[PDB]
Short mmCIF file of N, CA, C and O and ligand atoms in Angstrom, two decimals:
data_model
loop_
_atom_site.label_atom_id
_atom_site.label_comp_id
_atom_site.label_asym_id
_atom_site.label_seq_id
_atom_site.Cartn_x
_atom_site.Cartn_y
_atom_site.Cartn_z
N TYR A 1 4.27 -20.52 -11.85
CA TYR A 1 4.41 -19.69 -13.05
C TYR A 1 3.09 -19.07 -13.52
O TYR A 1 2.94 -18.76 -14.69
N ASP A 2 2.13 -18.92 -12.60
CA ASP A 2 0.84 -18.30 -12.89
C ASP A 2 1.01 -16.77 -12.89
O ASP A 2 1.24 -16.16 -11.85
N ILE A 3 0.93 -16.17 -14.09
CA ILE A 3 1.11 -14.72 -14.31
C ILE A 3 0.00 -13.91 -13.66
O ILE A 3 0.21 -12.72 -13.41
N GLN A 4 -1.19 -14.52 -13.39
CA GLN A 4 -2.31 -13.78 -12.79
C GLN A 4 -2.44 -13.92 -11.27
O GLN A 4 -3.26 -13.23 -10.67
N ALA A 5 -1.64 -14.85 -10.66
CA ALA A 5 -1.85 -15.16 -9.25
C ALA A 5 -1.65 -14.01 -8.29
O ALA A 5 -2.26 -14.01 -7.22
N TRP A 6 -0.85 -13.01 -8.66
CA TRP A 6 -0.60 -11.89 -7.79
C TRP A 6 -1.87 -11.15 -7.37
O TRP A 6 -1.88 -10.59 -6.28
N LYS A 7 -2.91 -11.14 -8.22
CA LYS A 7 -4.08 -10.31 -7.92
C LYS A 7 -4.81 -10.80 -6.66
O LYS A 7 -5.03 -10.03 -5.73
N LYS A 8 -5.12 -12.11 -6.59
CA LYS A 8 -5.78 -12.64 -5.40
C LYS A 8 -4.84 -12.55 -4.20
O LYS A 8 -5.28 -12.30 -3.10
N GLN A 9 -3.52 -12.75 -4.42
CA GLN A 9 -2.57 -12.61 -3.32
C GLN A 9 -2.58 -11.19 -2.75
O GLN A 9 -2.58 -11.02 -1.53
N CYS A 10 -2.69 -10.19 -3.62
CA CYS A 10 -2.79 -8.80 -3.16
C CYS A 10 -4.11 -8.53 -2.49
O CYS A 10 -4.13 -7.81 -1.50
N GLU A 11 -5.22 -9.11 -2.97
CA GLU A 11 -6.51 -8.94 -2.31
C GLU A 11 -6.44 -9.48 -0.88
O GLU A 11 -6.95 -8.84 0.04
N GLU A 12 -5.83 -10.67 -0.71
CA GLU A 12 -5.73 -11.27 0.60
C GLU A 12 -4.83 -10.45 1.50
O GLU A 12 -5.17 -10.27 2.67
N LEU A 13 -3.72 -9.91 0.97
CA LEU A 13 -2.85 -9.08 1.81
C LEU A 13 -3.56 -7.77 2.20
O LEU A 13 -3.48 -7.36 3.38
N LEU A 14 -4.36 -7.18 1.29
CA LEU A 14 -5.12 -5.99 1.67
C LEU A 14 -6.15 -6.32 2.73
O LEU A 14 -6.34 -5.53 3.65
N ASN A 15 -6.76 -7.51 2.69
CA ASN A 15 -7.71 -7.93 3.73
C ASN A 15 -7.00 -7.99 5.08
O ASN A 15 -7.53 -7.47 6.08
N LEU A 16 -5.78 -8.54 5.12
CA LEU A 16 -5.02 -8.60 6.37
C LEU A 16 -4.70 -7.20 6.85
O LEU A 16 -4.79 -6.92 8.05
N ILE A 17 -4.30 -6.30 5.93
CA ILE A 17 -3.97 -4.94 6.31
C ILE A 17 -5.20 -4.23 6.89
O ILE A 17 -5.07 -3.59 7.93
N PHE A 18 -6.40 -4.43 6.30
CA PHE A 18 -7.61 -3.81 6.85
C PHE A 18 -7.94 -4.35 8.25
O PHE A 18 -8.47 -3.61 9.07
N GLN A 19 -7.55 -5.60 8.57
CA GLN A 19 -7.76 -6.18 9.93
C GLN A 19 -6.78 -5.63 10.96
O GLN A 19 -7.06 -5.65 12.16
N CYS A 20 -5.59 -5.18 10.50
CA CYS A 20 -4.54 -4.62 11.36
C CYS A 20 -5.05 -3.30 11.92
O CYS A 20 -5.41 -2.41 11.16
N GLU A 21 -4.95 -3.12 13.25
CA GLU A 21 -5.30 -1.85 13.86
C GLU A 21 -4.38 -0.73 13.38
O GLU A 21 -4.80 0.42 13.29
N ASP A 22 -3.11 -1.05 13.04
CA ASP A 22 -2.19 -0.03 12.55
C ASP A 22 -2.62 0.59 11.23
O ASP A 22 -2.06 1.62 10.87
N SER A 23 -3.56 -0.05 10.47
CA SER A 23 -3.96 0.56 9.21
C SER A 23 -5.04 1.61 9.33
O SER A 23 -5.28 2.32 8.36
N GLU A 24 -5.68 1.76 10.49
CA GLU A 24 -6.84 2.64 10.59
C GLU A 24 -6.61 4.07 10.07
O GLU A 24 -7.47 4.51 9.31
N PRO A 25 -5.48 4.77 10.34
CA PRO A 25 -5.32 6.13 9.79
C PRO A 25 -5.18 6.18 8.28
O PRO A 25 -5.23 7.26 7.72
N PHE A 26 -4.96 5.04 7.63
CA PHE A 26 -4.63 4.95 6.21
C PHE A 26 -5.71 4.25 5.40
O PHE A 26 -5.47 4.00 4.23
N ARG A 27 -6.85 3.92 6.00
CA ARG A 27 -7.88 3.17 5.27
C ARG A 27 -8.66 3.98 4.29
O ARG A 27 -9.20 3.40 3.35
N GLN A 28 -8.77 5.29 4.51
CA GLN A 28 -9.52 6.20 3.66
C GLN A 28 -8.65 7.43 3.42
O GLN A 28 -7.69 7.68 4.16
N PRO A 29 -8.95 8.24 2.39
CA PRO A 29 -8.14 9.44 2.15
C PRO A 29 -8.04 10.33 3.39
O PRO A 29 -8.99 10.41 4.18
N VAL A 30 -6.88 10.96 3.60
CA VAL A 30 -6.69 11.90 4.71
C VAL A 30 -7.75 13.00 4.66
O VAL A 30 -8.06 13.48 3.57
N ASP A 31 -8.36 13.30 5.81
CA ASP A 31 -9.41 14.29 5.94
C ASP A 31 -8.79 15.67 6.00
O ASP A 31 -8.07 16.01 6.95
N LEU A 32 -9.07 16.46 4.99
CA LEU A 32 -8.52 17.80 4.91
C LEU A 32 -9.10 18.74 5.95
O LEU A 32 -8.46 19.74 6.25
N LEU A 33 -10.27 18.43 6.54
CA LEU A 33 -10.81 19.28 7.60
C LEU A 33 -10.01 19.05 8.89
O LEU A 33 -9.87 19.97 9.69
N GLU A 34 -9.53 17.81 9.11
CA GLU A 34 -8.71 17.48 10.27
C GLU A 34 -7.27 18.03 10.08
O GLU A 34 -6.63 18.45 11.04
N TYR A 35 -6.74 18.00 8.83
CA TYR A 35 -5.35 18.41 8.52
C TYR A 35 -5.40 19.39 7.34
O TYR A 35 -5.15 19.02 6.20
N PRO A 36 -5.77 20.66 7.60
CA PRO A 36 -6.01 21.59 6.47
C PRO A 36 -4.83 21.93 5.57
O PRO A 36 -5.03 22.34 4.44
N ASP A 37 -3.64 21.71 6.04
CA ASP A 37 -2.42 21.98 5.27
C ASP A 37 -1.90 20.73 4.56
O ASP A 37 -0.82 20.76 3.97
N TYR A 38 -2.64 19.60 4.59
CA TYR A 38 -2.14 18.35 4.01
C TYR A 38 -1.67 18.49 2.57
O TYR A 38 -0.57 18.02 2.26
N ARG A 39 -2.48 19.09 1.69
CA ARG A 39 -2.11 19.22 0.29
C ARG A 39 -0.99 20.25 0.03
O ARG A 39 -0.45 20.29 -1.08
N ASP A 40 -0.60 21.04 1.03
CA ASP A 40 0.56 21.95 0.90
C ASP A 40 1.87 21.12 0.98
O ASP A 40 2.89 21.55 0.44
N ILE A 41 1.85 19.95 1.62
CA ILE A 41 3.03 19.12 1.77
C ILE A 41 2.97 17.90 0.87
O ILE A 41 3.95 17.56 0.19
N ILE A 42 1.80 17.28 0.81
CA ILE A 42 1.61 16.06 0.03
C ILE A 42 1.01 16.29 -1.34
O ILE A 42 -0.13 16.74 -1.45
N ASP A 43 1.77 15.96 -2.38
CA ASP A 43 1.31 16.13 -3.76
C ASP A 43 0.36 15.07 -4.22
O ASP A 43 -0.53 15.34 -5.02
N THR A 44 0.59 13.82 -3.78
CA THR A 44 -0.23 12.72 -4.27
C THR A 44 -0.77 11.91 -3.12
O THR A 44 -0.12 10.95 -2.70
N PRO A 45 -1.97 12.25 -2.64
CA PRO A 45 -2.57 11.44 -1.57
C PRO A 45 -2.80 10.01 -2.02
O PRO A 45 -3.05 9.72 -3.19
N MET A 46 -2.73 9.09 -1.07
CA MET A 46 -2.99 7.68 -1.33
C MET A 46 -3.47 7.02 -0.04
O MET A 46 -3.08 7.44 1.04
N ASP A 47 -4.31 6.01 -0.16
CA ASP A 47 -4.87 5.33 1.00
C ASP A 47 -5.23 3.89 0.58
O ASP A 47 -5.28 3.60 -0.63
N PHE A 48 -5.49 2.99 1.53
CA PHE A 48 -5.73 1.59 1.19
C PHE A 48 -7.04 1.34 0.50
O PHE A 48 -7.11 0.37 -0.25
N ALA A 49 -8.07 2.17 0.75
CA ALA A 49 -9.33 1.95 0.00
C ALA A 49 -9.13 2.28 -1.48
O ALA A 49 -9.63 1.54 -2.32
N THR A 50 -8.35 3.31 -1.78
CA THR A 50 -8.05 3.65 -3.18
C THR A 50 -7.25 2.51 -3.83
O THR A 50 -7.56 2.08 -4.95
N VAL A 51 -6.29 1.94 -3.10
CA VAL A 51 -5.52 0.81 -3.64
C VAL A 51 -6.42 -0.39 -3.91
O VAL A 51 -6.37 -0.97 -4.99
N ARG A 52 -7.29 -0.74 -2.95
CA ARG A 52 -8.20 -1.87 -3.13
C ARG A 52 -9.14 -1.64 -4.30
O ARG A 52 -9.35 -2.56 -5.09
N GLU A 53 -9.69 -0.42 -4.42
CA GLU A 53 -10.60 -0.12 -5.51
C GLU A 53 -9.90 -0.16 -6.84
O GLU A 53 -10.50 -0.59 -7.82
N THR A 54 -8.67 0.31 -6.92
CA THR A 54 -7.90 0.30 -8.17
C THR A 54 -7.67 -1.16 -8.59
O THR A 54 -7.84 -1.50 -9.77
N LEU A 55 -7.29 -2.02 -7.64
CA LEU A 55 -7.10 -3.44 -7.90
C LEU A 55 -8.40 -4.11 -8.38
O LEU A 55 -8.42 -4.78 -9.43
N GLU A 56 -9.50 -3.88 -7.67
CA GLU A 56 -10.77 -4.49 -8.01
C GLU A 56 -11.33 -3.99 -9.33
O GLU A 56 -12.05 -4.74 -10.00
N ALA A 57 -11.02 -2.75 -9.73
CA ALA A 57 -11.41 -2.22 -11.03
C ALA A 57 -10.61 -2.82 -12.20
O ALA A 57 -10.96 -2.60 -13.36
N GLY A 58 -9.55 -3.56 -11.91
CA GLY A 58 -8.70 -4.08 -12.96
C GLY A 58 -7.85 -2.97 -13.51
O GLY A 58 -7.58 -2.94 -14.71
N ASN A 59 -7.39 -2.05 -12.64
CA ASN A 59 -6.58 -0.92 -13.06
C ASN A 59 -5.13 -1.01 -12.59
O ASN A 59 -4.38 -0.05 -12.76
N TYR A 60 -4.72 -2.18 -12.08
CA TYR A 60 -3.32 -2.47 -11.88
C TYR A 60 -2.95 -3.55 -12.89
O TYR A 60 -3.65 -4.54 -13.01
N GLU A 61 -1.84 -3.35 -13.60
CA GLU A 61 -1.35 -4.38 -14.52
C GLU A 61 -0.42 -5.39 -13.83
O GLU A 61 -0.30 -6.54 -14.27
N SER A 62 0.24 -4.98 -12.76
CA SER A 62 1.22 -5.81 -12.09
C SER A 62 1.21 -5.50 -10.60
O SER A 62 0.79 -4.41 -10.19
N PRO A 63 1.76 -6.41 -9.79
CA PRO A 63 1.88 -6.12 -8.35
C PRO A 63 2.91 -5.02 -8.06
O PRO A 63 2.83 -4.40 -7.01
N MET A 64 3.84 -4.74 -8.99
CA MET A 64 4.77 -3.63 -8.80
C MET A 64 4.03 -2.31 -8.73
O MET A 64 4.39 -1.45 -7.95
N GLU A 65 3.00 -2.13 -9.57
CA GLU A 65 2.22 -0.90 -9.55
C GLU A 65 1.47 -0.75 -8.23
O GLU A 65 1.41 0.34 -7.66
N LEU A 66 0.88 -1.84 -7.73
CA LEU A 66 0.20 -1.82 -6.43
C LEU A 66 1.20 -1.47 -5.32
O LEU A 66 0.90 -0.66 -4.44
N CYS A 67 2.37 -2.09 -5.37
CA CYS A 67 3.40 -1.87 -4.37
C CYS A 67 3.86 -0.38 -4.39
O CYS A 67 4.07 0.20 -3.32
N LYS A 68 3.95 0.26 -5.56
CA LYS A 68 4.31 1.67 -5.65
C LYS A 68 3.25 2.55 -4.94
O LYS A 68 3.61 3.42 -4.14
N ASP A 69 1.96 2.25 -5.14
CA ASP A 69 0.91 3.02 -4.46
C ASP A 69 0.92 2.77 -2.93
O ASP A 69 0.77 3.71 -2.16
N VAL A 70 1.13 1.50 -2.48
CA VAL A 70 1.17 1.26 -1.03
C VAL A 70 2.38 2.00 -0.42
O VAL A 70 2.25 2.61 0.63
N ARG A 71 3.53 1.97 -1.10
CA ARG A 71 4.70 2.66 -0.58
C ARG A 71 4.48 4.17 -0.52
O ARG A 71 5.00 4.81 0.40
N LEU A 72 3.65 4.72 -1.40
CA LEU A 72 3.28 6.14 -1.39
C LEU A 72 2.46 6.46 -0.14
O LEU A 72 2.67 7.51 0.46
N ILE A 73 1.62 5.53 0.33
CA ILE A 73 0.89 5.76 1.61
C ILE A 73 1.92 5.99 2.73
O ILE A 73 1.81 6.93 3.53
N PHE A 74 2.97 5.14 2.75
CA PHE A 74 3.96 5.26 3.82
C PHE A 74 4.86 6.47 3.64
O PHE A 74 5.17 7.12 4.64
N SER A 75 5.26 6.81 2.40
CA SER A 75 6.12 7.99 2.25
C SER A 75 5.33 9.25 2.53
O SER A 75 5.90 10.19 3.09
N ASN A 76 4.02 9.29 2.25
CA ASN A 76 3.21 10.46 2.59
C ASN A 76 3.15 10.62 4.10
O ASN A 76 3.30 11.73 4.62
N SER A 77 3.00 9.50 4.84
CA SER A 77 2.97 9.57 6.29
C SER A 77 4.29 10.12 6.84
O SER A 77 4.31 10.98 7.72
N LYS A 78 5.41 9.66 6.29
CA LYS A 78 6.71 10.15 6.72
C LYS A 78 6.92 11.63 6.37
O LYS A 78 7.52 12.36 7.17
N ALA A 79 6.42 12.06 5.20
CA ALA A 79 6.59 13.46 4.81
C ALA A 79 5.71 14.38 5.66
O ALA A 79 6.10 15.52 5.94
N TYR A 80 4.53 13.93 6.07
CA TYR A 80 3.62 14.79 6.83
C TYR A 80 3.87 14.78 8.32
O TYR A 80 3.41 15.68 9.02
N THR A 81 4.57 13.75 8.84
CA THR A 81 4.76 13.66 10.27
C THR A 81 5.55 14.85 10.83
O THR A 81 6.60 15.24 10.30
N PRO A 82 5.06 15.41 11.94
CA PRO A 82 5.84 16.50 12.57
C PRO A 82 7.01 15.94 13.40
O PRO A 82 7.90 16.70 13.81
N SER A 83 7.04 14.62 13.65
CA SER A 83 8.05 13.99 14.47
C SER A 83 8.23 12.53 14.08
O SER A 83 7.25 11.83 13.78
N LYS A 84 9.46 12.03 14.19
CA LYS A 84 9.69 10.60 13.95
C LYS A 84 9.10 9.72 15.07
O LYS A 84 8.99 8.51 14.89
N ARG A 85 8.66 10.32 16.17
CA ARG A 85 8.04 9.62 17.28
C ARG A 85 6.53 9.76 17.28
O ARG A 85 5.92 9.27 18.23
N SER A 86 5.90 10.42 16.28
CA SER A 86 4.46 10.61 16.31
C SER A 86 3.71 9.27 16.26
O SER A 86 4.19 8.30 15.65
N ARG A 87 2.52 9.24 16.83
CA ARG A 87 1.71 8.02 16.85
C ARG A 87 1.41 7.49 15.44
O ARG A 87 1.66 6.30 15.16
N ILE A 88 0.85 8.31 14.57
CA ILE A 88 0.43 7.83 13.24
C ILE A 88 1.64 7.39 12.42
O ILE A 88 1.61 6.32 11.80
N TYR A 89 2.75 8.14 12.47
CA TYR A 89 3.96 7.73 11.77
C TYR A 89 4.47 6.38 12.31
O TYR A 89 4.85 5.52 11.51
N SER A 90 4.46 6.16 13.64
CA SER A 90 4.92 4.89 14.19
C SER A 90 4.04 3.73 13.70
O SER A 90 4.54 2.64 13.46
N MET A 91 2.73 3.97 13.54
CA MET A 91 1.82 2.96 13.02
C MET A 91 2.20 2.67 11.55
O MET A 91 2.24 1.50 11.16
N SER A 92 2.53 3.70 10.76
CA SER A 92 2.92 3.47 9.38
C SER A 92 4.19 2.65 9.29
O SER A 92 4.26 1.83 8.40
N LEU A 93 5.16 2.82 10.22
CA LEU A 93 6.39 2.03 10.13
C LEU A 93 6.15 0.58 10.38
O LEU A 93 6.72 -0.26 9.69
N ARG A 94 5.29 0.27 11.36
CA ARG A 94 5.00 -1.15 11.62
C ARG A 94 4.24 -1.76 10.46
O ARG A 94 4.52 -2.89 10.04
N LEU A 95 3.26 -1.01 9.93
CA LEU A 95 2.46 -1.52 8.84
C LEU A 95 3.33 -1.72 7.59
O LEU A 95 3.15 -2.70 6.85
N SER A 96 4.31 -0.83 7.36
CA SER A 96 5.20 -0.94 6.22
C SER A 96 6.04 -2.21 6.36
O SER A 96 6.21 -2.93 5.37
N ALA A 97 6.55 -2.50 7.56
CA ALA A 97 7.34 -3.71 7.75
C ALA A 97 6.49 -4.95 7.48
O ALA A 97 6.95 -5.88 6.82
N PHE A 98 5.25 -4.97 7.95
CA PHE A 98 4.33 -6.08 7.70
C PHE A 98 4.07 -6.23 6.19
O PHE A 98 4.13 -7.32 5.64
N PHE A 99 3.79 -5.10 5.52
CA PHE A 99 3.54 -5.13 4.08
C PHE A 99 4.76 -5.65 3.31
O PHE A 99 4.59 -6.52 2.44
N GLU A 100 5.94 -5.11 3.60
CA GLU A 100 7.15 -5.52 2.87
C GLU A 100 7.45 -7.01 3.07
O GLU A 100 7.80 -7.71 2.11
N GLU A 101 7.21 -7.52 4.27
CA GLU A 101 7.44 -8.93 4.57
C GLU A 101 6.52 -9.82 3.74
O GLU A 101 6.95 -10.89 3.28
N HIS A 102 5.28 -9.38 3.49
CA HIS A 102 4.33 -10.19 2.75
C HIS A 102 4.38 -9.96 1.23
O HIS A 102 4.06 -10.90 0.48
N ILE A 103 4.70 -8.74 0.76
CA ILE A 103 4.70 -8.49 -0.69
C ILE A 103 5.90 -9.08 -1.39
O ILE A 103 5.84 -9.29 -2.59
N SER A 104 7.00 -9.33 -0.68
CA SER A 104 8.21 -9.85 -1.30
C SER A 104 7.99 -11.12 -2.13
O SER A 104 8.44 -11.16 -3.28
N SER A 105 7.25 -12.12 -1.61
CA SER A 105 7.01 -13.34 -2.38
C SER A 105 6.06 -13.10 -3.53
O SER A 105 6.20 -13.75 -4.57
N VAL A 106 5.10 -12.15 -3.37
CA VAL A 106 4.18 -11.85 -4.46
C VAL A 106 4.94 -11.28 -5.65
O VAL A 106 4.73 -11.71 -6.81
N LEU A 107 5.87 -10.37 -5.38
CA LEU A 107 6.66 -9.77 -6.44
C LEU A 107 7.59 -10.78 -7.04
O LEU A 107 7.66 -10.87 -8.26
N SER A 108 8.25 -11.61 -6.21
CA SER A 108 9.19 -12.59 -6.73
C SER A 108 8.47 -13.60 -7.62
O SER A 108 8.96 -13.96 -8.69
N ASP A 109 7.30 -14.11 -7.16
CA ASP A 109 6.57 -15.10 -7.94
C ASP A 109 6.11 -14.52 -9.26
O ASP A 109 6.21 -15.17 -10.31
N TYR A 110 5.59 -13.28 -9.25
CA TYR A 110 5.15 -12.65 -10.48
C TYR A 110 6.31 -12.47 -11.47
O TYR A 110 6.16 -12.83 -12.66
N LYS A 111 7.43 -11.91 -11.01
CA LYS A 111 8.56 -11.69 -11.90
C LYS A 111 9.11 -13.01 -12.45
O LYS A 111 9.42 -13.08 -13.62
N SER A 112 9.13 -14.05 -11.63
CA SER A 112 9.56 -15.38 -12.08
C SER A 112 8.58 -15.94 -13.15
O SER A 112 9.01 -16.47 -14.17
N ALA A 113 7.27 -15.79 -12.93
CA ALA A 113 6.27 -16.27 -13.89
C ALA A 113 6.41 -15.54 -15.19
O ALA A 113 6.29 -16.16 -16.26
N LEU A 114 6.67 -14.21 -15.16
CA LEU A 114 6.81 -13.46 -16.38
C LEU A 114 8.05 -13.87 -17.12
O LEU A 114 8.02 -13.98 -18.33
N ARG A 115 9.16 -14.12 -16.39
CA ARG A 115 10.38 -14.56 -17.05
C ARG A 115 10.17 -15.92 -17.72
O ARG A 115 10.62 -16.12 -18.83
N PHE A 116 9.41 -16.83 -17.08
CA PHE A 116 9.11 -18.13 -17.67
C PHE A 116 8.27 -17.96 -18.92
O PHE A 116 8.53 -18.57 -19.93
N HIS A 117 7.29 -17.05 -18.86
CA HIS A 117 6.43 -16.79 -20.01
C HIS A 117 7.24 -16.32 -21.23
O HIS A 117 7.00 -16.74 -22.37
N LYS A 118 8.24 -15.49 -20.98
CA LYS A 118 9.09 -14.93 -22.02
C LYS A 118 10.34 -15.73 -22.34
O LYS A 118 11.17 -15.24 -23.10
N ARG A 119 10.51 -16.93 -21.76
CA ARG A 119 11.72 -17.72 -21.97
C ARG A 119 11.99 -18.05 -23.44
O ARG A 119 11.05 -18.06 -24.24
C1 LIG B 201 -2.52 9.86 8.11
C2 LIG B 201 -2.22 11.35 8.06
C3 LIG B 201 -3.45 12.14 8.48
C4 LIG B 201 -0.98 11.63 8.92
N1 LIG B 201 0.20 11.15 8.43
C5 LIG B 201 1.29 11.14 9.29
C6 LIG B 201 1.15 11.61 10.64
CL1 LIG B 201 2.38 11.33 11.75
C7 LIG B 201 -0.09 12.17 11.01
C8 LIG B 201 -0.30 12.83 12.38
N2 LIG B 201 -1.56 13.33 12.57
O1 LIG B 201 0.56 12.94 13.25
N3 LIG B 201 -1.16 12.18 10.16
#
């Protein structure tokens, strides 16, 4: 029932994601010189360094907010992909499955702790 435990849990999950080779295209903001039309398709860029920095700045109130930004990394990859078989998009699908498998207990524990706090 620790209402604050999600933060270290998210730091550790981001550390695992940075170790994953599948995260390399998503570790820093997309390079507009490499993809000059990126902002014509993607309204809200997002990347894992921005997520980590937002967390470390104390600018996430809950793991749901972090999870919304990580899911935006994956939906941006899906929106920008020219093909469902592209290399970078395939890396995002595997990384998304890994992320969803690990974030589920973080979200459940947080929501349970908050419900206990408000009982
Ligand atoms: C990470 C950004 C640059 C991105 N998102 C999705 C795809 Cl699938 C691609 C690509 N180059 O094929 N690039």
